[PDB]
From a paper:
Plectasin consists of 40 amino acids and shows well-defined secondary structural elements in form of an α-helix (M13-S21) and an antiparallel β-sheet (G28-A31; V36-C39). The structure of plectasin is stabilized by three disulfide bridges (C4-C30; C15-C37; C19-C39), which is typical for this type of defensins and leads to high conformational stability. Plectasin contains a cysteine-stabilised α-helix-β-sheet structure, which remains intact upon fibril formation. We have determined the structure, kinetics, and functionality associated with the pH-responsive self-assembly of the enhanced plectasin variant PPI42 into helical protein fibrils.
In our negative stain EM measurement, we observed a small portion of fibrils existing as single protofilaments. In order to investigate whether there are structural rearrangements upon formation of the mature fibril, we analyzed the 3.4 Å resolution structure of PPI42 forming the single protofilament obtained by cryo-EM. The structure of the protofilament was determined using the structure of the mature fibril. PPI42 monomers show a very similar arrangement in the protofilament compared to the mature fibril (all-atom RMSD: 0.727 Å). The PPI42 protofilament forms a straight right-handed helical structure having an axial rise of 3.76 Å and a helical twist of 156.5° between two monomers. These helical parameters are very close to the seven monomers of the asymmetric unit in the mature fibril (average axial rise of 3.75 ± 0.15 Å and an average twist of 156.48 ± 2.25° between two consecutive monomers, see above). Small variations in axial rise and twist between the monomers in the mature fibril result from the curvature of the protofilament, which is then stabilized by the interaction with a second protofilament. A comparison between the cryo-EM structure of the mature fibril and of the isolated protofilament showed high similarity, indicating that protofilaments form prior to the supramolecular assembly into a curved mature fibril without additional structural rearrangement. We observed frayed fibril termini and a small number of single protofilaments (black arrows), suggesting that the protofilaments formed first and then assembled into the mature fibrils.
Residue numbers in the entry:
A (entry chain H), B (entry chain L), C (entry chain P), D (entry chain T), E (entry chain X), F (entry chain R), ...: 1 to 40
The structure:
Amino acid sequence: GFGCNGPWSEDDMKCHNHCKSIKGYKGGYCAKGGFLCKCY
Amino acid sequence: GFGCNGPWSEDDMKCHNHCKSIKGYKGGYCAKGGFLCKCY
Amino acid sequence: GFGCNGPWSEDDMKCHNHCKSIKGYKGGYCAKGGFLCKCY
Amino acid sequence: GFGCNGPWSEDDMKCHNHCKSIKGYKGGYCAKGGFLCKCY
Amino acid sequence: GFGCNGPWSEDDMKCHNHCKSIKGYKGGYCAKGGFLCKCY
Amino acid sequence: GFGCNGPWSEDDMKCHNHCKSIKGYKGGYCAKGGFLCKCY
Amino acid sequence: GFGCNGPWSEDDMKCHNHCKSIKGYKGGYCAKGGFLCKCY
Amino acid sequence: GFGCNGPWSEDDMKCHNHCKSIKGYKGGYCAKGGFLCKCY
Amino acid sequence: GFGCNGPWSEDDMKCHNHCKSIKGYKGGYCAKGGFLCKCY
Amino acid sequence: GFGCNGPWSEDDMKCHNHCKSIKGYKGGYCAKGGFLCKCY
Amino acid sequence: GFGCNGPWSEDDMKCHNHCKSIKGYKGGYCAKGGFLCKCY
Amino acid sequence: GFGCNGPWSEDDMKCHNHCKSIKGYKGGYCAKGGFLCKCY
Amino acid sequence: GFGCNGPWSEDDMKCHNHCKSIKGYKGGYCAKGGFLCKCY
Amino acid sequence: GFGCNGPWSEDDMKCHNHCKSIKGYKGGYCAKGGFLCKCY
Amino acid sequence: GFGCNGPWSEDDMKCHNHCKSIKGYKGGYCAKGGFLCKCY
Amino acid sequence: GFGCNGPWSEDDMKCHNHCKSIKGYKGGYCAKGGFLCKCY
Amino acid sequence: GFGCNGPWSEDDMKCHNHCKSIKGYKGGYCAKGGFLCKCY
Amino acid sequence: GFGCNGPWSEDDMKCHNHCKSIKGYKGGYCAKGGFLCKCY
Amino acid sequence: GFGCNGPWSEDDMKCHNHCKSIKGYKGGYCAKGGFLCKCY
Amino acid sequence: GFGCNGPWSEDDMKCHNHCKSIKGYKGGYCAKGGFLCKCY
Amino acid sequence: GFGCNGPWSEDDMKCHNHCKSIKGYKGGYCAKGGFLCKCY
Amino acid sequence: GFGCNGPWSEDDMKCHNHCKSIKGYKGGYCAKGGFLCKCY
Amino acid sequence: GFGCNGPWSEDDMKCHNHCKSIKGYKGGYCAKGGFLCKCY
Amino acid sequence: GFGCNGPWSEDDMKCHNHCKSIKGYKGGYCAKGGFLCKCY
Amino acid sequence: GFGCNGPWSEDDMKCHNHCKSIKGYKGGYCAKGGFLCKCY
């Protein structure tokens, strides 16, 4: 979810913004080859 | 199922929430290129 | 069949349940881009 | 034909059964986005 | 024409048979979402 | 809208032209698997 | 409803406008393969 | 547009031919997971 | 084109065979993540 | 081809089995990042 | 985001240009194996 | 095969378990940069 | 496995923690150039 | 960019040619493990 | 882990900083040829 | 280029053969840790 | 760190320049066989 | 080539066996720090 | 070979054990600066 | 072995401790220019 | 730096030429066991 | 050990300091041609 | 340079041959403990 | 230490200068056959 | 050359045998402190 949907993803930052909603995380990215919102 | 339906999927967390319904799993994602609810 | 009908599919588990009807298979999913009930 | 008629298709296996009528094919599915009986 | 008439189509192969009437084509299907006899 | 209507869409550029009607956008396309006019 | 009626839909924005009638939503589209007014 | 319509696309080269209509481009392809005519 | 259509591609060798139609090329494959017939 | 189709590939050994069909090759794999049947 | 989308990325410099938008950074690249816009 | 599918691989031990099925081998790993089940 | 997946690995300690599950081993690392969980 | 895209890179010399476009540089290569066009 | 990931490592000091988290250690480095966070 | 692409390189001699195309050079190799065709 | 990364290091002086940032040190080098920024 | 590929090399003796294919040479090894098949 | 692979070697005794497989030799070591299994 | 690995050796006493495991030997050192565990 | 990079160094004279850039020095060499450009 | 590592040794006094840790010894040095910490 | 590279040197006579290129010198050798081409 | 490192020593006077740092000593030299800084 | 390579030399008689290849010489040895094949 959060937009991590492979080639059909769109740069909506939903993964990034959602990850930003958690303390200790300054961003997120589509891991698992573009299919998981992984927060860091 | 559980919303893992490729480009026609919608961020309903149905995969994630369904995976959450099992002990030992803190989330889920659309593996198999967005076509399988894989729990982790 | 078994519900693997692209965007018009509904999460009826018919693919999954049908795949469950075979020994050695613990689930199924809509492969071929959501148009084939592939059992695993 | 053979039931591959998009959202108006019904799970009659007509595509699958028809494909089964040919040697070397163990099934069929509605390719072309649910509008062609493709045998495999 | 040739039977490609959406949900009111009937599996008369008229699209398929008509497409078969042309060299280089081994079949046909109701493209444009079930409303055009497309030959292949 | 704007023609993004899945397989029944027609190449009327209505999505593209409509997107062109907004500053900063040089085109548009049928995202959400062909069912949303997404402007870019 | 709201115009999400598959190939017989017309670009009346009824889905879009209806979705606009709810706070937090900047548009809507015909999900479920053109048969549900999904608001976003 | 230009035929980039996901699984319902047909190999009409409309994307490719349209891209060919621009200097500096020797072809085109359906990017965005088969839903955008991207010229190169 | 030539069958390079992501998950909805089918192993028709159309990319490969089409690439074979050019001197100096012994095959082809679906580059750009399965969305371009790249000849080699 | 031969199943080398990125994340949408399935472990059908089609690449491997196809490579096995050539003398001097004891297997094959999806090179080019999972998008080419490379025989060895 | 910013185009870092694995094999489906396109050389749009969106990662690079976006990274350029920050002082002290003269470029960017798709780290995490092509799935994160890392600025440098 | 056997799960050696680059970033889209999942830790199913299919490579490892498959390699275990051969005498003289105590494990396996995804060589060729994560795209070949190499047994050892 | 155990997370040793080259550039797509994530610092989940799965290799390390898994290695810790064996007596005589105080850690593990991704040998074979980041593609094997080697325990020490 | 410039083709430095890991395993999905193609030998288009785009990195090399782009680097050649700068005085004092006689070539370029995909540093950062194949993910950065580094000029030399 | 801790960033010791061969050529795909980035100078995040994660190895160094992590090693700093232990008494008696004034730094760390990527031993085992860049694939192990060794503390000193 | 010329096949010097780290772990995803294949023994195509493209580096070697390309280097052979220059007088005074009897071979080539993937320097820079497998990421540059260096001629000698 | 600081560029001391074995064969994948690049002559960026990051080790040297970083070492220069400390009083009493007129340079630095990649000790530990090219894997530690040692200041002198 | 011949397997001399740094940490991603595998003990396939391809360097050694290839060197054995030349008179006056009783073996070979991966010189240039594991990146050249040097025959002796 | 036989594990003599520079810094990426692991103490598998493969060089030593392999050397032990020859009469007159009571051990082996990684000569040529850790890149040749030399038997003694 | 036993840590005698040239410049990439680390002062783990593995050579020394291993040599200590034999009667008549009070230590060991990396002979052959740092590439052999010689016991004394 | 300046090419003094152990076994991965290449005879680019970068150490030598760089040392030549200073008055009183007629050459340079890779001291510290091939890991420091020492000028003389 | 203790830093007695031939040309790759660094003047860390580890040999000397370690030797100092024993009564009756006022220093140490790298005997065996720079490859053994000999205490005196 | 000229092959004087410690244990990783190879008997290429590059030091010797290079020294031969100067009048008054009948050979050369790797002085400075195998790390300088000294001509005589 | 202090530069007394056999053939790999360099005339840095580190032995001499270090010896000069002690009253009653007007110099130092590399005793023990070039492997000990002996002060006099 | 000819094996006169300091502590990393091996008793290959290459110096001796090479010296034997000249009339008036009954042997050779590694002069210059083990770094020159001197014939006598």
